[PDB]
Amino acid sequence: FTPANRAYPYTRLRRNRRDDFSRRLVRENVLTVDDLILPVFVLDGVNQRESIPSMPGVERLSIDQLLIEAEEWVALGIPALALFPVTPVEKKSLDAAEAYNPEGIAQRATRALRERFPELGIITDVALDPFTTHGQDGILDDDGYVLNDVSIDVLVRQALSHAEAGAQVVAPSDMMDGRIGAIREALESAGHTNVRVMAYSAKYASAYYGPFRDAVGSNKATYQMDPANSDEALHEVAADLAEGADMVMVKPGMPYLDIVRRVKDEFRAPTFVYQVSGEYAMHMGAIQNGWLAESVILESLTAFKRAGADGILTYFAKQAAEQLRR
């Protein structure tokens, strides 16, 4: 940046703000539907639609209902969904075998969506915490610590089962060291040459995941990042890029826009951000109370674009796409 000796009154920054036409001409960023990814909670069974108290307006959907809702998501131009299965309690186990079951919810939903909506991106969640008995992040040693490499073995099986089900993108959310490279080598070995890996690169140990936990039915500091740390996120992303990630993600979203910006600025790679359950809930609640105008939805999403995000995982994706088409 060079200020170029710009000085009032020769320079008045209000002149460009004076009229809509000039504000439009100098506008640095615009949000479009191309930027939006919808996370969706997927139930077992048939003809199920369940509200989530902590996420007003978001429903968990059985696969038949998901296919029905998706017709309109596609009609709105939403490029991709991110699937989050709501695992039946009885399918949770010590070594998370359900993660790689070809008849698991994520795998079934994937095959169904790929057949019905061939152009719709399906991003699966590579993660053991939907399948472990008490939502722990992976396979535990005798001290209750999440074992890094052993958990990766299971994550790899899971990633392969998602690729087999036809997922165009797998997104590992587990925060094990080196899992991106492990998953990429396994995809490459098995001939899944074009399956994208969207790394959750700089994922923070956060209070903002609370409502998601309520939605899926479920310590973090030994794998997820300390919210205090910014330089560390660069090291996380550099490793995931070296290991072969096609896209890198920051999570949570708005509370870490500084991280989105540093990551985009330093690596110039496809950079994604998750506007998490907590962010959605606090915005929606404030809107319902009449504390915040509905225009806050697009403002919050524009923030991600300005900060350098290429795409945004957001529960507002349908509302935003509606407000963008209109």
Among residue numbers 219 through 238, which ones bind Mg ion (CB under 5 A)? 236
Residues near Cl ion (CB under 5 A) are: 192, 194-195
Please spell the DSSP secondary structure of 181-206, one letter per residue.
Answer: HHHHHHHHHTT-TT-EEEEEEEEB--
Is 251 in the active site? Answer: yes
Q: Rounded to 5 degrees, what angle do the CA atoms 248, 129, 57 make?
A: 75
Cα distance between residue 71 and residue 236, in whole Å = 37
d(CA 304, CA 308): 6
Q: In the complex, what is the shortest distance from the CB of residue 47 to a copy of itself, in angstroms, rounded to a whole number?
A: 28
* Residues of this chain, 143-162, that bind a copy of itself according to CB under 8 A: 145, 148-149
In the complex with Cl ion, the residue whose CB is nearer, 10 or 291, is 10
Residue 46 binding partner per list Mg ion, a copy of itself, Cl ion, none, with a CB distance cut-off of 5 to 8 Å that depends on partner kind: none
Binding-site member from 107, 310, 315, 318 for a copy of itself (CB under 8 A): 310
Is the separation of the CB atoms in 81 and 39 below 8 Å? yes
Q: How far is the CB of 250 from Mg ion (least distance, A)?
A: 12
Per-residue x/- mask for a copy of itself, residues 215 to 254, rule CB under 8 A? Answer: ------xxx-xxxxxxxx-xxxxxx-xxxx-xx------x
125 DSSP β-pair partners: 171
Where are any strands of DSSP class E within the chain? 36-43, 49-51, 59-62, 80-85, 121-126, 169-172, 196-203, 247-251, 271-275, 311-314
Q: Which is nearer to Mg ion, 64 or 232 (CB)?
A: 232
Of Mg ion, Cl ion, a copy of itself, none, which one sits near residue 218, judging by CB under 5 to 8 A according to partner kind? none
Tokens of 8: 């009032």
- Decide: helix, strand or coil at residue 223: coil
Min separation Cβ 44 and a copy of itself, Å: 25
Check 91, 92, 203, 318 and give the catalytic one: 203
274 is in an annotated binding site: no
Identify any residues that bridge with 42 across adjacent strands, giving them in sequence order: 61, 85
Work out the angle between the directed axes of helices 148-165 and 105-116 (0-180°, nearest 10): 30
Q: Which stretch binds a copy of itself (CB under 8 A): 94-102, 156-164, 210-218, 315-323?
A: 210-218
Contact 249, 312 (CB under 8 A): no
Decide if residue 190 touches a copy of itself (CB under 8 A): no
User: Is 17 annotated as belonging to a binding site?
Assistant: no
Return the number of the residue (93 or 232) whose C-beta is nearest a copy of itself: 232
Closest approach, Cβ 173 to Mg ion, in A, equals 11
Q: Which residues are catalytic?
A: 203, 251
Point out which residues bind Mg ion (CB under 5 A): 236
Q: Which residues are annotated as a binding site for Mg(2+)?
A: 236
